[PDB]
Design a protein around this nucleic acid. Sequence first.
DNA 1: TGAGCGGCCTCGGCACCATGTGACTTA
DNA 2: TAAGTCACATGGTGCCGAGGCCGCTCA
Lengths: 241, 69, 171, 679, 111
Amino acid sequence: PYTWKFLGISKQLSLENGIAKLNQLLNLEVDLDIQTIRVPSDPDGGTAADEYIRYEMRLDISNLDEGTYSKFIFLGNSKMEVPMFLCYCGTDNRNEVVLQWLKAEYGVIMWPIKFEQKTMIKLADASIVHVTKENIEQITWFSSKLYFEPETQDKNLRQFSIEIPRESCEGLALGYGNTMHPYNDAIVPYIYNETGMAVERLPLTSVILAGHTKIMRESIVTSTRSLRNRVLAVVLQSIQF
Amino acid sequence: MDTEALANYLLRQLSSSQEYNKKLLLACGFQAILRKILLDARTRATAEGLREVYPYHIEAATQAFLDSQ
Amino acid sequence: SSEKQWERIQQLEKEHVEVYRELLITLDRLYLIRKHNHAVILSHTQQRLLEIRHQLQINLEKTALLIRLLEKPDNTNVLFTKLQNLLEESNSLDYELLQSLGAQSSLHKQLIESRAERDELMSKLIELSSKFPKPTTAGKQVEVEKENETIQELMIALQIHSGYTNISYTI
Amino acid sequence: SLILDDIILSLTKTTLSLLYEKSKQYGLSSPQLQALVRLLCETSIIDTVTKVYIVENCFLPDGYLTKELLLEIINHLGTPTVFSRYRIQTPPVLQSALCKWLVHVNISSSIWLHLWQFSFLQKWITPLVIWQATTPVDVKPWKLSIIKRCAMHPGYRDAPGSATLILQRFQCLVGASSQITESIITINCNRKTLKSHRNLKLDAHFLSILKRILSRAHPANFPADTVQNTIDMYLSEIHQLGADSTVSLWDVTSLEQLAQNWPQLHIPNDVDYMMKPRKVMSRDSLKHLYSSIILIKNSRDESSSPYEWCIWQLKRCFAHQIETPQEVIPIIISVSSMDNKLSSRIIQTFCNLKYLKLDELTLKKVCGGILPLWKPELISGTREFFVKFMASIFMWSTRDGHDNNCTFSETCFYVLQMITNWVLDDKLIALGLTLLHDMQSLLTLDKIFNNATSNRFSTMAFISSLDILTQLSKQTKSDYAIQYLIVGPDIMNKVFSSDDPLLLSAACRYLVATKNKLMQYPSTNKFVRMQNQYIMDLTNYLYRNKVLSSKSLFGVSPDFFKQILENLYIPTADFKNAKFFTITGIPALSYICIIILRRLETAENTKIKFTSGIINEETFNNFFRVHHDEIGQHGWIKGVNNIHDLRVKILMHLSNTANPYRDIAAFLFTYLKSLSKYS
Amino acid sequence: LQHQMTIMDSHIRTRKARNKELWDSLADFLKGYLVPNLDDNDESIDSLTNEVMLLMKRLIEHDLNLTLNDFSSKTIPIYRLLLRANIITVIEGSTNPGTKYIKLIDFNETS
DNA sequence: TGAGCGGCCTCGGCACCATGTGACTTA
DNA sequence: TAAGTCACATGGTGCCGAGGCCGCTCA
């Protein structure tokens, strides 16, 4: 239950320099981690300019809950119109101090990120593909639940959900064929063919993967302590102009 | 419902300024009894491991309290 | 059901004027091609006169059976009342257009003079800002400031809670 | 007034009524309010119901509340303690009503917070300590500890909900002072008591009384509208609570501050806060001037922070990234309407087809906010770029098939306003006039501006261009070329054929202006005979009724014009070839003349009304035939005996100061020797 | 800015001044109002006031040895006034039960 | 101006699946 | 020691009757 709030950044800011100023301001050492991930390793997802820069800023004091574990995750690519976004979990009041310092030090323009319906479908696609230490990608199947809150006159239809079990989801994926985006290619077309609902047009408020994560229109909350690389990448292509 | 309302309850139970102060101190003592009894109830519930308290917990706590009083 | 009739005759008259305009255009270009062999590359100065003769034929027909219906007021046909409704809504808003245009033009003049004034002010302030010179222990200072804050807040608390009858802003 | 403090010194029944009525008429001054509250608090011979009636009905300030009034009030809000027994206890209902009246109107924040621990004051202290907390540095963990300690304290009633409101305001304000939402969780979770606390009533009858008193008070100091807005925003701050040597630019609070430390001023890189938007001077008191201050402190170039902020927040609006693309659009418009480099950069990077496809509404708004003020830096290449942009938007509008789409016409109106700004200056006037001619060429194409599918947007753009041409023709001091006032015959005859009365009036205005300019020009040039052709065709179409005898009308020979009349059935063939070719026969001016005739009948109180719904020679003759003896004596428009006299009398009424059709009457009064005497 | 250019063509002192002003204002307040209203120590206000300033100086300097032992019977109303302000921490010592260690809450933190 | 019905809505009690962790077993 | 099965105790979503204030609302 770690909600991730997403904010975009107008500039490619380099964090390996100047973080000592943040350490002096906050009177505590942060555990900045540098990684260079290549998310679209699939040939159909692109084979060039796939490298990202992943920063994991962490206000490390103690490890009991998110009151002392408000992580910060930054992702960046210099070959894009918008070059950087951040996402941070927890509810500590030092996080907005970190954001204010980031603004006042790098001169960046920061705005909250809202996901569209197709963006949420692509994020649900991204959050099942897991990278393994043997450098392979594994699709872990979760019993999804598309959850809608339509606005109709006289509040005729307040809300309606579409629950899809795990074995039915993998059966739909195997029926479509060998694909790496199951929801956008197999689940959503099956829903459209059966019930007539275009879920990329309907007001979709959340899709819930049971036991793993439940992404919303403005936040992503995950049972897992971190956020995988595919979700970060899909958020990064989401905010492009 | 303030402590002065409980003082009003006590005076209408018994039926100037100095007696009002006496009754206000009595209301403070009554609140102290209730807080101590509820603290003992949580202590015994946590001893048994239950998150909430139950009537037998607080009955045993108040019998132990009135045994000493 | 009368509103349905008016809506229906509305799209019928829209399609009617559309098909008549394009029919007139196709008829005139058909005459041009049939008199020539393939001359279809006529200039803008000729296509415009084709548009002019189209426009005068259109408004001449409008006036022509405007003569036919408005000459004798029957006051019984509903098309007659439709003509007065259309006319009274057409001529109603004519003055407000020019009034709003003139007011917004005066607004535009105000924009022009305000922009000129701000351009002058920015020019002067850039000239002045280039003439100013460039911009150029504290361990006990923060401690004595903290002591000042604690002493003044304790003074506020003692002045209020003791019922002292002179509360003032003591620096 | 002096009656108020005279009654006050008298009090040191009739006096109460006099004080009430003089407060309801004048209102007391700040020393008068001080003396009144000092007299009311110290004595107790006055009845308590009259005390609360005074503080709810008589205390009416006139100007600023001085600090001494607040200090005197604070002296009376205390309670007798073990260190102060000589002073008497102020009645708690009087204290609560005085705090409520204070609601009606760093040290002082702690003063009000330490008075918040009083139980009976808590229902009205809370708006004061909310409104005092305006800055993130105001809150502190000791304040939070005191608020939580008094909130969770028993023996109180209003403390949970109101203190939860205080903590919610603090959480919405600072975003620091490590997390206090779990402290809110420890306090009540009913969402009902603080729901009633978050909306507060201020006795709007007393608000109206103070409103009228303050409106009677000082000119240009508290006008009524700003007072109502300030009260409304102070209430809405309660309502929406559910969700050292150098000086920084934030800490500067007054215009005096900027002077002595301008060379010691440090501009911060906090662009989003200072560009995105009170009687107290603070960081947000001078937030208006920050954008200009950055461009003064850092010399103007296309790398400064406000330019990048405007570019980025406009790309966000075009890419549908922002939730509300109407909060930052006025900010971008206000910043970039001036400061020519930023506006030129926005025009170069956004005024094209690609960003038109993304969002045409925001592009229309930025064209309304940038184009009317722009003046080019490079004269060459501007015309070709603007022709390309207008062609692109015209293809984009016309491929849709919907003629209701008015973006091209609206941006055309904006660029005609830009041409107005260009021709206001004597330099680069040829570029503006050529762009005006290009816009006139685009506006008159029969894809949006037709005789069947009307478009009044295009007519408005056209009459705006004609108005700018008339205002340009009156400038003698500018030696522009003579060829830039004509628009070709192909536009003029087409817009003469168009049935729009305002557009015909604008065309007559353009002809009147260009002839009054062309009178000093030689009488035989390439364009003088062109203007002569214009006026002879327009006069023949408007008044003469001699179309068939002319050589041509609007470039069309009258044989075709007669052949259209052939096979064109008319119910009465008395006068067919001259019935509807006049001022009453024009499609845009037929019923207008009938309205004018009816108003002339109403003005003269004529018993006879023109029953026929068309003014022509046949109807005029029949109207005199049916009522000959009534027309002969009295009961109709005086001084009119024929249809020509009727048209002249109509033209008199169109020349009055009540219609937007002045210019057609002046055109007929100018270029007609018979009508030259009616000028 | 034109005026400032014409003028220019031709700090710790108020911090310490306000510190000393707060010191003497507190001294006048305690020597004239609070102790005389307490009217204890047989109207010898200064003898008790010396101990009062000692306790206040220990409170401002945040002495860790402050407790209820050094408060006399005359200073008990003063301590009750301080407690009513809710600006002090009342915590019983773990090493010495019954001795309530007393210090002011931090008036300067920005957490 | 004053009583007055209706959507709202939150309290909270209940119902049920969902969930994370220690204890214990398997390899 | 990595992984698995287990009941267990708490988290949480949905549901609904009670009741309150609100929101005009109409005479």
